[PDB]
């Protein structure tokens, strides 16, 4: 509540030796201070004798400490190279980039008229700023709000005025309205035009929408699947007048995409998400209700669509369970694989009418999921050599409806070609030692014998597989192949050398390097990725890593930095589950596999992130299949796995009391009929019934 220091933004000189002391900063440095409990916008260039003891002293001192040494490592030393000057400055540059975006406001939450100390009352708006979550939204008065972001305020009024809440939706519960085949693209697609395989998809979802049945979207990995739902959401809203708060659950990795995908393909319905913690938890509820608390279920209704991470489902299962929902969206719904899932019966409690999964999950790996999917969409509904025809007579005829199978043979005609090459790498020197000795406890127990015990099975069928191509995944390996006792050339050479795969990768990489292709590395193991992190920097190739350990904000920054027109790094390394998590790469052509991902198809999506509709540079894929190892066999089982892949009466006096006041306020009100009804002023009656009453009422008047 007090005026105290919150953070550091910017640092500059105040006044016209070897190391600046703190005094120098006090008598020769001015620092931009952001104040506590107050938006970014009011930042002051202040010193220490200027403010004196103010609550909060800690961050400036250290930051100055960081500053003092920083000064000794840019201008005040001759061990500094060319490149460190680039980073030490660079930080100044990026530290401000993450500070600039807070000044631009992004949404106005509410508007309160609060009194001042001069006896005046001024309007204030709860303002939300860019790429930040709902917390630290402070009140700012309206004087300059439109004076910097007119567009936000224009839109701020529009939603409040656009009476289209879940308050007027048509009763089609009992039975439906006959629905129509669309030819044309709906006058609700501002994002552009779609094609001849995105409007029909939509016409099936909406086509079994009117049946009372739910369906499975099973298309290829990225055939404008997201556009088909958003448009599916859009046409179920201005078609059958459904204001029904639609619930959508998507991955924490793939939502930011969705939002923009939702706010650019369909302006007029607003999209408020759920991605906070403790504080947010409250702000969601601020706008999730009207008029504070509410008897019964009499919430006036201020949203329709939401996006939920999978976490958050389970953390607050209860509140959603109570509120009614009749339409469901989920992203990459191969989650419901087993029928013992926690989200598997978590979803069943949410009073629901129609569902909508949309993933390319292959449905022959196990028959469990094939059944689980069928049991989940439709609770209740469900081999022999010569009965197989009898069997698919039952399975083909029944499964199809709630299924979609459609090949690329679309939009791929423009997109440059797809390709994948295997790699037979035979074993090395130090390699056999630990391919041979490890399958016993001979020299595996002499060196690291205490650990031998726990990894002994790990190493057999879930390591040898993983530690067959590369033995560098334990401790007593690094110096084993390096034959000497600081060297820089040798370490680089010693590490490239041990593996069949490291050399093969180093040369191909070089081979395309001079030709110009952007290369991708998908590794199964977290560490491999540091391993390379250590080597590629050394040999000077600009890169960034994509692990399982990164904040949403940080994940998002680089993904974009990469697909921008003029980005230097053609090397990008990714995960199997963390890599194929979600996202798309449109600049990339080449993708290389170190080891198969203990399974058929984790790779098939793994290449899906790079091989998408956009890519204009064909495609290239390399699989490093190890020889005379254990990699070979799974590769064969993997094959075994993927072998199959298949009127309201009349107007009463009180309304007549309602209509009369509205005329004194708005004059002729025949034009404004729906806006008033959406909000309190009018009951739902047909447009004419009011209009005639409006006219006779003056006719009586004259």
């Amino acid at each position: 509540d007090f005026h105290g220091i919150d953070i550091v933004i910017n640092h500059r000189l105040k006044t016209s030796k070897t190391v600046p002391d703190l005094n120098n900063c006090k008598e020769n440095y001015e620092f931009l201070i952001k104040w506590t409990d107050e938006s970014h916008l009011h930042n002051t260039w202040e010193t220490y004798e200027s403010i004196g003891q103010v609550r909060g002293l800690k961050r400036l001192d250290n930051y100055c400490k960081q500053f003092i040494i920083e000064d000794q490592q840019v201008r005040l030393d001759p061990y500094v190279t060319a490149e460190d000057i680039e980073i030490m400055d660079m930080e100044r540059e990026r530290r401000l980039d993450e500070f600039e975006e807070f000044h631009v406001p992004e949404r106005i939450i509410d508007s309160q008229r609060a009194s001042l100390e001069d006896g005046t009352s001024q309007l204030q708006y709860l303002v939300k700023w860019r790429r930040l979550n709902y917390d630290e939204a402070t009140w700012e008065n309206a004087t300059d709000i439109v004076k910097l972001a007119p567009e936000q305020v224009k839109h701020f009024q529009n939603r409040e005025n656009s009476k289209i809440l879940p308050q007027y939706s048509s009763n089609y519960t009992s039975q439906r309205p006959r629905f129509e085949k669309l030819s044309v693209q709906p006058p609700f697609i501002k994002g552009g035009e779609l094609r001849d395989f995105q409007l029909t998809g939509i016409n099936w979802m909406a086509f079994l929408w009117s049946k009372g049945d739910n369906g499975i979207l099973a298309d290829e990995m990225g055939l404008g699947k997201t556009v088909q739902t958003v448009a599916f959401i859009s046409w179920l809203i201005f078609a059958r007048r459904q204001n029904g708060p639609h619930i959508i659950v998507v991955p924490l990795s793939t939502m930011p995409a969705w939002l923009d995908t939702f706010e650019k393909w369909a302006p007029d319905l607003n999209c408020i998400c759920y991605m906070g913690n403790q504080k947010s938890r409250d702000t969601i509820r601020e706008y999730e209700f009207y008029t504070n608390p509410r008897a019964k279920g009499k919430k006036t209704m201020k949203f329709n669509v939401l996006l939920t991470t999978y976490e958050y489902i389970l953390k607050d299962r209860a509140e959603l369970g109570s509120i009614k929902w009749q339409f469901m969206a989920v992203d990459e719904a191969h989650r419901l694989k087993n029928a013992e899932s926690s989200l598997y019966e978590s979803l069943n409690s949410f009073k629901v009418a129609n569902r909508m999964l949309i993933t390319g999950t292959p449905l022959q790996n196990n028959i469990k999921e094939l059944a689980a999917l069928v049991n989940f969409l439709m609770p209740g509904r469900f081999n022999q050599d010569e009965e197989q025809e009898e069997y698919i007579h039952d399975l083909h005829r029944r499964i199809q409806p709630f299924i979609l199978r459609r090949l690329k043979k679309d939009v791929e005609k423009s997109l440059p070609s797809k390709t994948e090459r295997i790699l037979r790498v035979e074993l090395s020197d130090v390699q056999t030692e630990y391919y041979k000795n490890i399958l016993t406890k001979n020299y595996s127990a002499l060196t690291a014998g205490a650990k031998g015990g726990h990894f002994s099975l790990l190493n057999i069928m879930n390591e040898l597989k993983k530690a067959s191509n590369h033995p560098y995944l334990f401790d007593n390996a690094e110096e084993r192949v390096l034959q000497k006792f600081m060297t820089r050339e040798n370490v680089l050479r010693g590490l490239i050398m041990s593996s069949g795969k490291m050399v093969l990768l180093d040369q191909l990489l070089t081979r395309l390097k001079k030709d110009g292709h952007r290369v991708l590395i998908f590794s199964q193991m977290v560490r491999m990725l540091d391993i390379l992190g250590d080597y590629l920097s050394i040999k000077g190739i600009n890169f960034q890593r994509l692990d399982g350990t990164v904040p949403s904000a940080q994940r998002r920054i680089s993904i974009d930095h990469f697909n921008s027109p003029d980005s230097n790094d053609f090397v990008f390394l990714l995960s199997t589950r963390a890599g194929g998590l979600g996202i798309n790469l449109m600049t990339a052509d080449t993708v290389v596999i170190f080891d198969s991902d203990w399974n058929p198809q984790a790779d098939l999506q793994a290449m899906a992130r790079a091989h998408r509709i956009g890519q204009k540079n064909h495609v290239m894929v390399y699989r490093l299949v190890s020889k005379d190892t254990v990699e070979e066999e799974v590769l064969e089982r993997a094959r075994k796995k993927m072998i199959l892949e298949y009127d309201m009466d009349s107007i009463g006096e009180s309304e007549v009391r309602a209509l009369y006041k509205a005329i004194l306020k708005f004059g002729n009100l025949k034009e404004i009929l729906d806006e008033l009804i959406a909000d309190g002023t009018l009951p739902v009656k047909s447009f004419e019934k009011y209009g005639e009453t409006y006219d006779e009422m003056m006719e009586a008047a004259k």
Partner: protein, 97 residues
């Protein structure tokens, strides 16, 4: 809540008593055993409970220890459990020499 001097001291104690959850985590402990158990024999396996059970034993074993330790500690004009306070306790029980 009165002032602040020795205010929590007795507070946490009470809340901990009403509860009945494991004092020590159930993840570090799990390996600690696996790791020594190897030194006395090879190729080991573990029942889910077996550890659960050890945790129970051990935790309970220590508390008990501390419980005396406390007394000893009191005897001494002190409210501080000490490195030895531990020893006497054990010595007189007899595992400690």
């Amino acid at each position: 809540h009165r002032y602040r001097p020795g205010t929590v001291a007795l507070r946490e104690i009470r809340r901990y008593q009403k509860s009945t959850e494991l004092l020590i985590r159930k993840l570090p402990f799990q390996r600690l055993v696996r790791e020594i158990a190897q030194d006395f024999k090879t190729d080991l396996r573990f029942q889910s409970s077996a550890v659960m059970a050890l945790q129970e034993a051990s935790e309970a074993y220590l508390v008990g220890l501390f419980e005396d330790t406390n007394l000893c500690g009191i005897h001494a004009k002190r409210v501080t459990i000490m490195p030895k306070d531990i020893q006497l306790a054990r010595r007189i029980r007899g595992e400690r020499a």
